[PDB]
Amino acid sequence: SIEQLSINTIRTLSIDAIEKANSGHPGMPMGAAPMAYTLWTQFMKHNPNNPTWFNRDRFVLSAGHGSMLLYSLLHLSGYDVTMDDLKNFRQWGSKTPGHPEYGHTAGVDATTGPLGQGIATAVGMAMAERHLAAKYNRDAYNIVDHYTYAICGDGDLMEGVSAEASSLAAHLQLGRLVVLYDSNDISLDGDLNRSFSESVEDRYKAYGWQVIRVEDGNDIEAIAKAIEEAKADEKRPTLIEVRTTIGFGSPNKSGKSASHGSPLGVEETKLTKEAYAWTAEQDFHVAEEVYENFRKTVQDVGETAQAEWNTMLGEYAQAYPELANELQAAMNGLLPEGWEQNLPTYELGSKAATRNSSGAVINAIAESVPSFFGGSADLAGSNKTYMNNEKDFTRDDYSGKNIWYGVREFAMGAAMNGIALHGGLKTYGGTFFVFSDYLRPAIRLAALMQLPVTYVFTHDSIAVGEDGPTHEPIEQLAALRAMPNVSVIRPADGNESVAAWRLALESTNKPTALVLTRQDLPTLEGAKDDTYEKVAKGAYVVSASKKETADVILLATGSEVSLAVEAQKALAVDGVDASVVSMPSMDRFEAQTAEYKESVLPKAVTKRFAIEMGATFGWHRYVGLEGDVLGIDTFGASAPGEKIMEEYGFTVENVVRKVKEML
């Protein structure tokens, strides 16, 4: 009956916070408060005074809309989420935003809301945990050893991304992933049965998960049994279908979707509190006995767990000083001193496809940077992402560094977020640039969360050639350039692409999309010296005009810079004096100083011509009303890459003509 009291406090806090905000989702906090309370207080190892503890159990509220459930538990458990925080649910500047936000609220492990992704993120977190354990754990010292938990709803399990991530998690046999499914026959919009009649249990057994059913979500002893069972089966990831009733306790709107997405309201709140034998007559009431219960079951237990872990760690250090030092540095995102010495250089006269350049870099990194971990969505041979002297990450060897994601772009993107969130690893994921659209929503969460993951997007243009328009990117550059807090770098040759990789690996608070070619690019002279400082500025002058004042500026990126440089000679002959600007990254250029920008794009020179095999959208920021751009505003074609390029106008002859045309 104290557990019951605690459960009803969670319920009642949630409801009251939502009444006060006059916004929010009360229904599932009420249905799910029991299973959540049981997991949080009886199974999870976590320290409310140190939410950042490396070996804490991880937790993901995949069903984001139920955020008050998480906020309640955090507050009641002694995390730094106060009563005044709860009373500011969904308000400007809150620590209690409408959906959970990693980095903004103490104890929130991931940002959820977009449905399905929380589960896939958790799958990434569980990958990181076994990978780190294999790398770092030794005799006695189970230094990395924890579980990964999530709570989801019906929506989550309809989304393809959760389907992909579950297939994957089963294949890697991630036995410490445990997902609690709030199964209540209601969706965002009405009865589940309006969209949904599949057998979740049977699908998950088919993947290869353990599934365990709980008939009565209000039965704590049963949920507790299922989790015990979940945790003893280290072989399979486990799903626990917990049968609950949405808005439990609301007489009028319990059974209904009406209870899902808006405050139950003053009269119905009173009635609900009745139904709970909730006598407390002030809102936001929590009994001393309830705090005490959480202090006993969560705070004291996590405290002790953490203290022992720290003692183990100190012993681990003496017994394995260099190993423990490496781990320390990895947990802190520090790259080893001098790691970049390893990297390729491309000599004047060489030719390299930037996907190949990227592969050579990836191999030099795997050798010099112990925290590197990544793979491809089933395109390893085409993306060049494979670490040739590293093992595969598998159910049989969690220490392998090469991940085989299969044809699961979206789950890949979301797992990468989970890998980064965990800490202790630098990750990357490869697919064809044209398929970046498949994982777009995960990129956006990586941007929101400030996660420094790296995407290896190859086959970046119509130069892809025979595969045709469904495989040729056109608008993909603009679609990422417009997104807040993503860096997009499209290197113009081998050396720019080594600098690009350094910038991606060095990132701490934003994802980096590397945009790479299928086809060979000529090593540029203007790029060879101080490439890193050049690429770091985002745009620099790769080939100066003759006078301090150019007749025209050619701007180009990636594979079009070489083109721009030939055009430049061709124009010199005809008495036109061009400078060439290489712009491997618009976002980095934009962050530079008014004085630096002005030194690369002189305001008095209005004659500017951008060249890029992609949408023209975005280029007028640089070329203005009086400049022009050679880009591509239609889809591509199926033909040898160089034939499309010629037909689409990417030839010196055409650039010279279009340029002479506008001055």
Query: How many C-beta neighbours within 10 Å does residue 590 have?
Result: 12
> Which among 20, 30, 23 has a CA at the least distance from the CA of 278?
30
Whether 629 contacts 616, CB under 8 Å = yes
Indicate whether 103 belongs to the interface with its own copies (CB under 8 A). Answer: no
| Closer to Cl ion by Cβ: residue 64 or 370 | 64
Residues 346-385 within binding reach of its own copies (CB under 8 A): 376, 378-381
The Cα–Cα gap between 59 and 302 comes to 15
Q: Does 58 bind its own copies (CB under 8 A)?
A: no
Q: Where does 159-218 have alpha helices with state H? A: 160-171, 200-207
How far does CA 348 lie from the centroid of its chain?
Answer: 37
C-alpha–C-alpha distance, residues 59 and 149, integer Å? 5
Kindly tell me which residue out of 34, 66, 114, 153 binds Cl ion, with binding defined by CB under 5 A. Answer: 153
User: Quick one: what does residue 552 bind among Cl ion, Mg ion, its own copies, none, with the CB cut-off 5 to 8 Å set by partner type?
Assistant: none
Q: How far is the CB of 186 from Mg ion (least distance, A)?
A: 4
- Note whether 219 binds its own copies by CB under 8 A: no
The per-residue DSSP string of 223-275 comes to HHHHHHHHHH--SS-EEEEEE--TTTT-TTTTTSGGGTSS---HHHHHHHHHH
| 80, 185, 392, 566: residue in contact with its own copies (rule CB under 8 A) | 392
Residues 147-176, interacting with its own copies (CB under 8 A): 154-156, 158-164, 167-168, 170-171
The site string for Cl ion over 184-203 (x = CB under 5 A, - otherwise) reads ---x----------------
Is 281 strand, coil or helix? coil
Instruction: Return the SS3 of 397.
Output: strand
Q: Residues 375, 404: contact at Cβ < 8 Å?
A: yes
Q: Between 136 and 155, how does the x/- string for binding to Mg ion read (CB under 5 A)?
A: -----------------xx-
Q: Which of 216, 208, 114 is nearest to 156 (CA)?
A: 114
For its own copies, which is the closer residue by CB, 426 or 481? 481
**CA gap 127, 182 in Å, rounded:** 24
Q: Which residue number, 158 or 271, has a Cβ lying nearer to its own copies?
A: 158
Which residues lie across from 182 on neighbouring strands?
A: 242
Active site residue 409: yes
Is 487 one of the binding residues for Mg ion (CB under 5 A)?
A: no
245 touching Mg ion, by CB under 5 A: no
As a whole number of angstroms, the distance between CA 128 and CA 124 comes to 6
For residue 43, give the nearest of 179, 181, 147, 183 by alpha carbon.
147
Beta bridge partners of 520: 353
Binding to its own copies (CB under 8 A) within 70-99 occurs at 90-94, 97-99
Give me the sheet containing 552-556, strands edge to edge: 540-543, 578-582, 552-556, 608-611, 628-630
Closest among 40, 29, 122, 109 to 67, alpha carbons compared: 29
Choose the catalytic residue: 159, 164, 268, 409: 409
Three-class secondary structure of residue 367 per DSSP: helix
Region of 282-290, 305-313, 537-545, 630-638 interacting with its own copies (CB under 8 A): 630-638
559 φ/ψ angles, rounded to the nearest 5 degrees: -70, -10
Binding mask 452-481 for its own copies (x = CB under 8 A): -------------xxxxxxx--xx--xx-x
Q: Could you tell me if 514 and 539 are in contact, meaning their C-beta atoms sit under 8 angstroms apart?
A: no
106 touches which of Mg ion, its own copies, Cl ion, none (CB within 5 to 8 A by kind)? none
Residue 205 in the binding site for its own copies (CB under 8 A):
yes
Tokens read off for 199: 């057998």
Instruction: Kindly state the number of chain residues that form the binding site for Cl ion, as judged by CB under 5 A.
Output: 4
Q: Point out which span in 184-192, 319-327, 518-526, 528-536 binds its own copies (CB under 8 A).
A: 184-192
CB of 326 to its own copies, least distance (A): 28
Q: Which is nearer to Mg ion, 154 or 159 (CB)?
A: 154
159 forms part of the interface with Cl ion (CB under 5 A): no
Binding part of the chain for Cl ion, among 182-190, 211-219, 488-496, 559-567 by CB under 5 A, reads 182-190
Q: For Mg ion, what does the binding mask look like between residues 178 and 197, x meaning CB under 5 A?
A: ------x-x-----------
Reading the block at residue 37, the tokens are: 């309370």
* Of 485, 592, 651, 654, the one binding its own copies by CB under 8 A: 485
What is the rounded CA–CA span in Å between residue 250 and residue 30? 9
Q: Does 34 help bind Cl ion (rule: CB under 5 A)?
A: no
What would the DSSP string read from start to end of 507-552? -SSS-EEEE--SSEEEPPHHHHTTHHHHHHTS-EEEE--SSSS-SE
Buried b (16+ CB within 10 A) or exposed e, 151-170: bbbbbbbbbebbbbbbbbbb
Q: Which is nearer to its own copies, 150 or 445 (CB)?
A: 445
User: Is residue 116 at the binding interface for Cl ion, with CB under 5 A as the rule?
Assistant: no
Shortest gap between Cβ of 83 and its own copies (angstroms)?
19
User: What, of its own copies, Cl ion, Mg ion, none, does residue 467 touch, CB below 5 to 8 Å by kind?
Assistant: its own copies
196 touches its own copies by CB under 8 A: yes
Choices 175-183, 240-248, 417-425, 622-630 (CB under 8 A): range interacting with its own copies: 622-630
Structure tokens of 372? 């590197």
Q: How far is the CB of 93 from its own copies (least distance, A)?
A: 7
What is the total count of residues that contact its own copies (CB under 8 A)?
Answer: 110
* Cβ(59)–Cβ(146) below 8 Å: no
Among positions 14-33, residues that touch its own copies (CB under 8 A) are 21, 23-24
Q: Kindly state the smallest distance separating residue 473's Cβ from its own copies, in Å.
A: 10
The residue assigned the tokens 């990958």 is 127
* Binding track, positions 232-261, relative to its own copies; x by CB under 8 A: ------------------------------
Contact region with its own copies (CB under 8 A), list: 288-296, 333-341, 354-362, 621-629: 621-629
Give me the helices (H) in 25-106, please: 27-42, 67-77, 83-86
Chain centroid to Cα 173, Å, comes to 22
Minimum CB–partner distance for residue 159 and its own copies (Å): 6
Q: Confirm or reject binding of residue 332 to its own copies (CB under 8 A).
A: no
Query: Where along the sequence are the contacts to Mg ion (CB under 5 A)?
Result: 153-154, 184, 186
Active site positions, annotated: 409
Binding site for Cl ion (CB under 5 A): 153-155, 187
